[PDB]
Amino acid sequence: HSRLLERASRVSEEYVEKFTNGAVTGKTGSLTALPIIETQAGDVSAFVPTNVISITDGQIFLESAMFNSGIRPAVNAGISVSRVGGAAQTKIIKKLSGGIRTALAQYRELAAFAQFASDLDEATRKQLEHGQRVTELMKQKQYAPMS
Amino acid sequence: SEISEIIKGRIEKLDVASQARNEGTIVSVSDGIVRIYGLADVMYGEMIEFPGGVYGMALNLEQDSVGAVVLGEYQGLAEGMNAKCTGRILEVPVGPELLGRVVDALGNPIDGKGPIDAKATDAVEKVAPGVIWRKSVDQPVQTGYKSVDAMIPVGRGQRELIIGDRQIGKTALAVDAIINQKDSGIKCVYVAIGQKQSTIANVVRKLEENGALANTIVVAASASESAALQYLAPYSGCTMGEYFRDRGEDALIVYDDLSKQAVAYRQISLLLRRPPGREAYPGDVFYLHSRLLERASRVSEEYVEKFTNGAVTGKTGSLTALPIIETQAGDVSAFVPTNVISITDGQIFLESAMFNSGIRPAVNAGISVSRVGGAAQTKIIKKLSGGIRTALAQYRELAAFAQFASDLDEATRKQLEHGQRVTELMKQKQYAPMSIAEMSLSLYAAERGFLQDVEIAKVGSFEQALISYFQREHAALLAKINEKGDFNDEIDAGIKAGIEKFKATQ
Amino acid sequence: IVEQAKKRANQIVDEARDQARTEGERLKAQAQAEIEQELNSVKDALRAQVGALAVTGAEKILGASIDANAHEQLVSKLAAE
Amino acid sequence: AKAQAAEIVEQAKKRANQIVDEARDQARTEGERLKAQAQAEIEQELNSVKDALRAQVGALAVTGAEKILGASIDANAHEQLVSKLAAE
Amino acid sequence: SSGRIVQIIGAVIDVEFPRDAVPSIYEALKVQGVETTLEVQQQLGDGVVRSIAMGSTEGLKRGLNVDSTGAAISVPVGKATLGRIMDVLGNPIDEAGPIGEEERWGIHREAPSYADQAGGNELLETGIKVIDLVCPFAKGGKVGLFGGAGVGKTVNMMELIRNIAIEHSGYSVFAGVGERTREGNDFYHEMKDSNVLDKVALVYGQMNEPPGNRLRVALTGLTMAEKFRDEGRDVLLFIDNIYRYTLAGTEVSALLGRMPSAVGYQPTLAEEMGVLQERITSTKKGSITSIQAVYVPADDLTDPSPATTFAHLDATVVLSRDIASLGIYPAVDPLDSTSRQLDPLVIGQDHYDTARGVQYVLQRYKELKDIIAILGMDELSEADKLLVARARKIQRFLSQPFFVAEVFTGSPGKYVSLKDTIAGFKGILNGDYDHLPEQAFYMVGGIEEAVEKAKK
Amino acid sequence: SSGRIVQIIGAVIDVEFPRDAVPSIYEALKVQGVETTLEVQQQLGDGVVRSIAMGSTEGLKRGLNVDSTGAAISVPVGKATLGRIMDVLGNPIDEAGPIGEEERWGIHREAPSYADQAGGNELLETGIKVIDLVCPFAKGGKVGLFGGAGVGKTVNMMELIRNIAIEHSGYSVFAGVGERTREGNDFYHEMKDSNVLDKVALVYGQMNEPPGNRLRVALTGLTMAEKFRDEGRDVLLFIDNIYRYTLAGTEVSALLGRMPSAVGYQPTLAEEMGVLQERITSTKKGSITSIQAVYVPADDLTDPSPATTFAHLDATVVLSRDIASLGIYPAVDPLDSTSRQLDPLVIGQDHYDTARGVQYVLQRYKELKDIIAILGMDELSEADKLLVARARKIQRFLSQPFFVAEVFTGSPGKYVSLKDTIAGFKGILNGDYDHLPEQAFYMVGGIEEAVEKAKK
Numbered sequence A: 001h002s003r004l005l006e007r008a009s010r011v012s013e014e015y016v017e018k019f020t021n022g023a024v025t026g027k028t029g030s031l032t033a034l035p036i037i038e039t040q041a042g043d044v045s046a047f048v049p050t051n052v053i054s055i056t057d058g059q060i061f062l063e064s065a066m067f068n069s070g071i072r073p074a075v076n077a078g079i080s081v082s083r084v085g086g087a088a089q090t091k092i093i094k095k096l097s098g099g100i101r102t103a104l105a106q107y108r109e110l111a112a113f114a115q116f117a118s119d120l121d122e123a124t125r126k127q128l129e130h131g132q133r134v135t136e137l138m139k140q141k142q143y144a145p146m147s
Numbered sequence B: 001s002e003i004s005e006i007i008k009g010r011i012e013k014l015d016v017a018s019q020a021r022n023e024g025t026i027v028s029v030s031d032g033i034v035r036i037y038g039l040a041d042v043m044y045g046e047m048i049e050f051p052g053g054v055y056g057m058a059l060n061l062e063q064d065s066v067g068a069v070v071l072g073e074y075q076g077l078a079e080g081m082n083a084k085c086t087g088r089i090l091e092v093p094v095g096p097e098l099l100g101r102v103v104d105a106l107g108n109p110i111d112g113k114g115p116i117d118a119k120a121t122d123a124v125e126k127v128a129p130g131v132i133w134r135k136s137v138d139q140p141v142q143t144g145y146k147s148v149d150a151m152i153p154v155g156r157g158q159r160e161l162i163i164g165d166r167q168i169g170k171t172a173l174a175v176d177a178i179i180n181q182k183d184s185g186i187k188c189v190y191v192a193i194g195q196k197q198s199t200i201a202n203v204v205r206k207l208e209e210n211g212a213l214a215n216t217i218v219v220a221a222s223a224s225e226s227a228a229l230q231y232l233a234p235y236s237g238c239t240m241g242e243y244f245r246d247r248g249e250d251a252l253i254v255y256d257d258l259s260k261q262a263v264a265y266r267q268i269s270l271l272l273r274r275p276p277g278r279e280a281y282p283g284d285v286f287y288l289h290s291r292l293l294e295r296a297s298r299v300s301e302e303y304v305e306k307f308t309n310g311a312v313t314g315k316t317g318s319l320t321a322l323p324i325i326e327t328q329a330g331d332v333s334a335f336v337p338t339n340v341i342s343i344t345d346g347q348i349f350l351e352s353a354m355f356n357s358g359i360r361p362a363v364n365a366g367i368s369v370s371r372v373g374g375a376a377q378t379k380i381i382k383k384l385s386g387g388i389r390t391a392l393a394q395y396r397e398l399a400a401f402a403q404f405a406s407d408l409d410e411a412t413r414k415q416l417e418h419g420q421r422v423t424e425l426m427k428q429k430q431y432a433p434m435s436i437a438e439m440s441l442s443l444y445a446a447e448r449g450f451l452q453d454v455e456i457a458k459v460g461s462f463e464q465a466l467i468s469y470f471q472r473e474h475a476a477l478l479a480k481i482n483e484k485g486d487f488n489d490e491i492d493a494g495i496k497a498g499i500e501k502f503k504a505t506q
Numbered sequence C: 001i002v003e004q005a006k007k008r009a010n011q012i013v014d015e016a017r018d019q020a021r022t023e024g025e026r027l028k029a030q031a032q033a034e035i036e037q038e039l040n041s042v043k044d045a046l047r048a049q050v051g052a053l054a055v056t057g058a059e060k061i062l063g064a065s066i067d068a069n070a071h072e073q074l075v076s077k078l079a080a081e
Numbered sequence D: 001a002k003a004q005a006a007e008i009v010e011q012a013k014k015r016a017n018q019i020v021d022e023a024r025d026q027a028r029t030e031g032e033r034l035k036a037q038a039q040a041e042i043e044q045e046l047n048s049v050k051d052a053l054r055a056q057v058g059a060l061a062v063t064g065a066e067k068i069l070g071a072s073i074d075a076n077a078h079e080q081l082v083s084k085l086a087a088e
Numbered sequence E, F: 001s002s003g004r005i006v007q008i009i010g011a012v013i014d015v016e017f018p019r020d021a022v023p024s025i026y027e028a029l030k031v032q033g034v035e036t037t038l039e040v041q042q043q044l045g046d047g048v049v050r051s052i053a054m055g056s057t058e059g060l061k062r063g064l065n066v067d068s069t070g071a072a073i074s075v076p077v078g079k080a081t082l083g084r085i086m087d088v089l090g091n092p093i094d095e096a097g098p099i100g101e102e103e104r105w106g107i108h109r110e111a112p113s114y115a116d117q118a119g120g121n122e123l124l125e126t127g128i129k130v131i132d133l134v135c136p137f138a139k140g141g142k143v144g145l146f147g148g149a150g151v152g153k154t155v156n157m158m159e160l161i162r163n164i165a166i167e168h169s170g171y172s173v174f175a176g177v178g179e180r181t182r183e184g185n186d187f188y189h190e191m192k193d194s195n196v197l198d199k200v201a202l203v204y205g206q207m208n209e210p211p212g213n214r215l216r217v218a219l220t221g222l223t224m225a226e227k228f229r230d231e232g233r234d235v236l237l238f239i240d241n242i243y244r245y246t247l248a249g250t251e252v253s254a255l256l257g258r259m260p261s262a263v264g265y266q267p268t269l270a271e272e273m274g275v276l277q278e279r280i281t282s283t284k285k286g287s288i289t290s291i292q293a294v295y296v297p298a299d300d301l302t303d304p305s306p307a308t309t310f311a312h313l314d315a316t317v318v319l320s321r322d323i324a325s326l327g328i329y330p331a332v333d334p335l336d337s338t339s340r341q342l343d344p345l346v347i348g349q350d351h352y353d354t355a356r357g358v359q360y361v362l363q364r365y366k367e368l369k370d371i372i373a374i375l376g377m378d379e380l381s382e383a384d385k386l387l388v389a390r391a392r393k394i395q396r397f398l399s400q401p402f403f404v405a406e407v408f409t410g411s412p413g414k415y416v417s418l419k420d421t422i423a424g425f426k427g428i429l430n431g432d433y434d435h436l437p438e439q440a441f442y443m444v445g446g447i448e449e450a451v452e453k454a455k456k
């Protein structure tokens, strides 16, 4: 897998011009990869899953409990991460999506802690309410992409 | 000023005659194992001589070749090189000349303080004294810790395992047990197996800063050294400790990681292609540790008079062992830990949850045990440890009620605070060993109720100030208790009067 | 209370002075031993090289007399050995 | 009163720690003085033995052979000692 | 004839013999000029045999001459073995000279046949009340002993050794499978001081001995016990730890290169246990009864070693640290300890009802004690307080002064009969002794002794 | 003389030489025609050596002639290596032409002797709250960043490099072992754009390279650091992942004819690790300060590789996946992280008491978490309710915005001094901030910024 996945890369203008013998100049080239891996009952300790998670520039974890709970995209925001971050986003999405994932990661924790507690402060209530709204917003249908 | 010409005069008095030698030729070299062709008379365990002053040991005497392991560096050896029988088994230097020195697994000095002057050598592999030559363990070995010396006592000739996870005080407890012997009469041996060289140097620097180095032999087989040297180091250190026991004296030995010795023996075995078992260990890994640990013993006066040929009489010798083992996430059911727990006389279990809760010595007194028990205690500690056991047991039963101390019944609430004050008394500092008299003040004060008006948070400063008071106004009483750890109605009344006077003014 | 406080302080300072003295004798002993063993180390290190060069000379010296006189004496002696 | 008693004991504990740490610096100061001087003393002595050992190395080579082979080597030792001393 | 050593790999040694003189499986071989014994494990073919050294292999070399003995490891048997300590080969490890043997027997044999079995179940009267009531032992049966250290295991073994010899004309054999050398010396002196040493033969395989010694010691002790059974006796065979017998088999199986089974045990686990346990039975001449200490790995009762051993146990005696604190020195737990002989179709309706009656009352009292602790003694009914009083009397009447414990108890020993045991507990259950103080029922022996101890 | 390839299997190659010209262990060999280097690992016998390719074998054939170089891999060392990117063989992997070396050293060497070790406790400030508090680093000490996949090993190391290497007056070696080629490019452009590339030697062996390359890249980088240490200089050595060195040995071990050990690892795991780790040390000539990132397979710290690594380090920093899953970075576990410097004699009593005080509160909160989940928070004592509030504030005050992580968070980075860290935690433990909400302490810096954040 490491010999396969290290080919997916972005090459400099100097690399393209040399290969294309001057035919193409001022242009960078790229190959982006989306490998898929299947786990058994959520077990990531298996040899193959352990290897591939340690090679890629990020991962998108899909959870079965969330899929059955109605969140069909099923992306676990606490476990999923991108190692390129804001550099892979346009200016508008880069500024609007600021700390949304770490805030969703903390909302999932605050909900379980406040499940059976007596009335808490405005900071806690406001955070818990904002979290239930971003969570419902992240839901989307198949074959329906957004610009 | 001139010495080279006189040392050469001796070199002109050395044998230049031919000698019949039994030889062989190196066939293959890999991973520290050199396979030889020839050597028809080599014995199992004999040392082979290679070019360059490199030595090996014969371990696989197969029909068509000899599998030998290098006791040094094997990357200079090659196919076609000559190999020679020595007619000898592995032997190490022994005697008082080793005290205050740092040596390798073969007895060579590594500290740079000069050559060793040992007057005798002995075999690393030997059998333990038989059943009929032993004597029951009934003499104490004080470690200087109130939790160990009061509840898990160690006697002369006993084998007590220090067991627990990484980074929780295993090394600190064993080094402090060595430091406390500087005035006792027990000689000490520390064996470092698979440790990094800078860690071994911090322990020796701490043995020197505490005055314990002059009474200790340090045997080292660091992590970059051959697996054969790491496998043999515990036996070399044991052989150095057996000198004092066989001659009528007492010694203490610490094996800093028997689990690293097992890992080194597994490497050699799988590379010799010996059939594997559970966790890939060879079939004789139990026999490896058992053959080592059964040498730690107490021998009778008749064995010492037989060995000394009459020279030493009326004295019983001993070798006490403190082997150390690391567990992975508290799993005591692993193969090597299970073997050693079954071989030893008792176990001191250290816990990560207790260590993170500020209980620095980390001794779980609820599962730790000494099968020798009260026979390994002085009279004063044996009388004051009985109630300490009951109070901690009651505290383990009543630990959930702390959040409801108001709602408790008075009797139970009285027991709860006693349990919490005795629990806070067990906490101690590193490199601060306590004497029998100083331990007796603290145990007496708690067991006789002198802590009921002290806030659980001030128990420690009360202990420190109480010992300092008795060291000034009662120096004669502390000296009297320190003779034999004796107890009587005059000592009991004397300690009581001093504690009452301490509270009335300090 | 104040007189016993002065007494506690007196022992603390008296023992601190003896402790300070105790570390002074230990520290100087460490340096003294280190210099004495450094001197014997230089003597034994050069001794090893001096021996190696003397043995190299002995090899050449031996070769001339060894061939005529020693070749018959060595062969006959080895049969007796 | 007891607040002043505690202040007397606490200041004495602080003062005791200073008495010991000043002695550690004083001990190191003299230790470095001794170390520097001793290295220079040995270095000068080492030059005297350097020239002396060159000459005796040739003599020690002949003394080993000089026992048994020394009867025959009486003749070779004259030629070999002057040649080996000049060759080094 | 004689052979030659061809290969040495740890404790495993290969020997080559002439084609007409190859030694048999389990045959004992002697190395010339060295005190080393080899037991043959497998015949590799071409004249070569694979054997396991019964000692250290240090100093041995290829080409040494080896002699066949014609039979398996043969050990001394009979009266001369009493009061002596021996190794796996039957050599006297004590410095008391040679054993005055008249005969020697090989350690390997078949279990008694289907026709040699006794015609029913006969209880072995131990003379100990709690065992004879709640844990009845069958003659020729196997008893598992459970518990930690310092709870009376040694004192209980010495009392059983004394009673089989004095009250039944029998003898005992102790097999120290993986014995600790310190504990082996202490046990030898404790039995000499308690005057029971001349009633038992001691066979020790110490922990520092090779795997082959620890595996064969159980067969050496069993061979000495078989001799006394043939004499016409009922014999006690004590095995220091049956888990160490299983582990020694695992170690030997790994050394011989066999493929390991479930949880890493030897593939022969059930057969090795069956070969040992099937010799311990009640024949038509005598009966070997065995008391075996049992260790449970990782506290798991489903692990192959506990699982296999429990298949051959007729009774389970559990010693309790809590009961000891109460002051009942025997320390046997009446609720956790069990026996397969506790059946009305074997011991009769009377013994069964009396034992089950004692267990019912003691169960109810353990539940009521939590009520008394949480809510108070005033919260209980009149019938429940009467039960608590009988339960306490029963609990103390389960105690008994042993002849080997006179040094600790300061009172003479007692041997209670099964008849006296049943009658005493039946009376306390029915209430015939409700007027006596509970202390009168402590350390007394039979029920008539409680009556008098109360009179004063 | 000359040899012929006789057997190619994956990355392992056998070369047969005249029986009088067999190359030494670890000796480098060159294939004729093909540009490939082979290092002898084993001498099988009969003039054959077993070697591992330092390149690809797709172009190799049986019968190709191989040349013996008479020595091990010799890489360039000294001042000429600064500001250059190199491979395992020391060849330049940047377009800046050749390197003006004045000496070449062999990658294989002995560890410094026991008499050459040096001891020092100079405190090194990092600027991170959690580390400066519970894991205080020392100049010349060994640091390890333990953690699984995706928890911050590279990010934290980059922050340290920035807070130490940039200010460090001496030289530096950065070794990328089994790293992503994208991280190596970002770091090279980062050192070049920051003008610090002039004092940093860069050695890269990424995941796209053959096992032999990833097995010796660590020895190449260390050989360059050892040349600088031996010149009397103070050096910084950063290793991206030292696990890839162990893994490359596991990938090739079975083809080298070695039987596997526990968890499918090479039987030489502890020696191969000790031989590398004992060279990364501070002797009496110069001081190497080193930071190593240690990958933890499947987040299990008991795995043989991570478990064997702890004993080689002075400072152990542990990163937790459960903390990262709550959006808290740095994801350092304050109960599993430790340092030899966490001692009252070295750091002072105030810092030590504050660190132990923080650890006590966090351990008590870890055991109250389950209570709060099942029963709820109102069923706790008044002392426990207060402790749970402070534990949640301490847990959030350990988070910190980093300068190297602004692309991931969008928030500006912060550098907190050791004085500020101790003050902020001492205040939370004392109760000086029991009115501010727990969200005010999340991602801020010093304690004043929590006070400002709370208002908004």
Ligand SMILES: Nc1ncnc2c1ncn2[C@@H]1O[C@H](COP(=O)(O)OP(=O)(O)OP(=O)(O)O)[C@@H](O)[C@H]1O
Pocket (backbone or CB within 6 Å): B165, B166, B167, B168, B169, B170, B171, B172, B173, B326, B360, B361, B428, B429, B430, F311, F339, F340, F342, F343
């Ligand atoms: N009273 C104490 N007793 C023991 N250790 C203490 C105590 N107080 C503080 N410590 C510290 O706890 C740590 C224990 O380290 P130690 O080497 O003894 O543990 P270990 O379990 O043997 O570690 P390792 O597995 O690396 O060998 C050290 O930093 C030590 O200074």
Ligand SMILES: Nc1ncnc2c1ncn2[C@@H]1O[C@H](COP(=O)(O)OP(=O)(O)O)[C@@H](O)[C@H]1O
Pocket (backbone or CB within 6 Å): A081, A082, A083, A084, A085, F147, F148, F149, F150, F151, F152, F153, F154, F155, F156, F329, F330, F402, F405, F408, F409
């Ligand atoms: N300090 C941090 N601040 C913010 N995000 C972080 C931080 N550390 C790690 N991350 C997240 O995780 C990634 C970094 O993981 P990385 O350092 O590559 O981990 P590892 O080396 O352990 O695999 C970033 O891309 C980011 O999404």
Ligand SMILES: Nc1ncnc2c1ncn2[C@@H]1O[C@H](COP(=O)(O)OP(=O)(O)O)[C@@H](O)[C@H]1O
Pocket (backbone or CB within 6 Å): E148, E149, E150, E151, E152, E153, E154, E155, E156, E329, E330, E402, E405, E408, E409
């Ligand atoms: N029957 C008994 N009567 C009185 N005390 C006993 C009795 N059985 C055990 N004890 C006490 O318990 C201690 C340990 O008993 P022991 O049989 O040696 O157990 P273990 O062998 O496990 O050590 C004895 O020394 C004695 O103090």
Ligand SMILES: [Mg+2]
Pocket (backbone or CB within 6 Å): B170, B171, B256
């Ligand atoms: Mg340690």
Ligand SMILES: [Mg+2]
Pocket (backbone or CB within 6 Å): F153, F154
């Ligand atoms: Mg990374």
